[PDB]
Write a protein that binds this ligand. Structure first.
Ligand SMILES: Cc1cn([C@H]2C[C@H](OP(=O)(O)O)[C@@H](COP(=O)(O)O)O2)c(=O)[nH]c1=O
Ligand SMILES: [Ca+2]
Length: 129
């Protein structure tokens, strides 16, 4: 996989942002994770964690996997990096997202993320508390 540029337009919630990609506004949905919706337990904490990470970043990058790049709602599907750190992984590692929506052929970083999840669960963080 390869990283590509984007800029933040607006943080939205635990697992979506509005990014400018190739000069066009798009909603992006994080691959391989699920955060609680804002109305749900740890929802606001996930939103805030994601927001801070992408707003504080000097450089945002998107990394598409090998399969589908947009979902049925027209959202981009990517791994999102904030100054080289994967937002997807960071949410999982803090117990603010579960590994989820693992579809065959768009699952390059599955094991990386499952490792993070196991460490969050061991530490009983947030969702796992
Ligand atoms: C993360 C992800 C979600 N989706 C679709 C499946 C789910 O469909 P449904 O809307 O029919 O449930 C929805 C979950 O996203 P959200 O967790 O953002 O709601 O988005 C994909 O199609 N591919 C993906 O990689
Ligand atoms: Ca969600």
């Amino acid at each position: 996989l390869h990283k590509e540029p984007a800029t933040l337009i607006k943080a939205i919630d635990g697992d979506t942002d509005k990014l400018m990609y190739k000069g066009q506004p798009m909603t992006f949905r994080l691959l391989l994770v699920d955060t609680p919706e804002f109305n749900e337990k740890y929802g606001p904490e996930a939103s805030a964690f994601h927001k801070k990470m992408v707003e504080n970043a000097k450089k945002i990058e998107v990394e598409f996997d090998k399969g589908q790049r947009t979902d049925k709602y027209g959202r981009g599907l990517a791994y999102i990096y904030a100054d080289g750190k994967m937002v997807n992984e960071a949410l999982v590692r803090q117990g603010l997202a579960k590994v989820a929506y693992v579809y065959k052929g768009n699952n390059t970083h599955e094991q990386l993320l499952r490792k993070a999840e196991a460490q969050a669960k061991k530490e009983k963080l947030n969702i796992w508390s």
